[PDB]
């Protein structure tokens with residue numbers, strides 16, 4: 001089997017991407033944030049505290065003839081930004097782009113933090129990291145990909161995120177028309193539960209490539225590119241007037257600037273992030289200070305190849321017995 005679904009930016013900045021997901025019988029379609037940095041499929045629901053729902057589409061298990069309470073199971077998760085959610089668990093039928101999994105754990109939110117409430121465009125998360133990160137207790141649950149894998153034509157999914165435009169998530173096949181050149185594969189460590197790999201270096205603009213190992217995760221659920229402070233300083237030093245602002249929370253730059261590209265290495269291959277992908281717009285409405293798309297990972301504890309990097313590539317998440325990651329230009 002295979003599946004193919006379009007993913008759509010939630011706003012004009014590509015702050016996140018949503019993909020429609022069918023849950024239950026008859027189907028309930030929710031727009032979920034596919035997150036290769038976590039491993040829970042959770043949804044706004046008829047169980048979510050009413051005052052914490054503001055425009056989201058909710059899953060109502062009682063309206064689904066295939067929903068079953070997973071008795072005794074609960075979940076609770078925290079994300080990079082301090083946001084969180086928690087609740088109880090149902091199993092139900094879940095389909096993504098024509099690919100169906102029966103018996104999928106659907107984590108129903110009883111509680112969500114304010115940042116979720118405040119974002120009406122995201123109805124929940126669909127985690128695509130390794131199932132060892134799943135938070136369900138006392139019986140950990142498998143991700144949608146994990147459950148689907150044995151039915152797939154090939155045990156892979158691909159992320160093809162757009163810059164200010166829709167893109168695609170495919171399951172079970174590699175669309176050889178969606179990229180240019182060849183795919184370069186690179187080793188993955190699953191020891192922290194992430195799609196963790198080592199970039200071979202970077203370049204800023206038209207500058208020379210610096211060969212240096214940069215360990216980090218391929219994370220569709222993180223907006224920005226978070227790299228070591230040395231690398232980030234070298235990038236922003238090429239932008240007149242750019243500065244790290246402790247009050248804003250990172251590097252800012254004049255909105256009048258033309259940003260340089262940023263290149264990262266994948267083995268002997270190179271992925272070029274155009275400068276415009278690194279512009280996250282005014283820090284506040286009407287400001288002439290703009291927020292940068294490359295930020296320091298110092299204090300996070302890990303480097304994160306988030307959407308700013310991934311959207312410059314066609315990315316293969318290869319879930320074979322020894323997982324690997326592939327990157328191609330497009």
Ligand SMILES: N=C(N)c1ccc(C(F)(F)F)cc1
Pocket residue numbers: 035036037038078079080219220221222300302
């Ligand atoms: N995409 C995610 N859900 C995510 C959240 C937190 C981190 C960490 F805190 F570890 F950096 C990394 C990834």
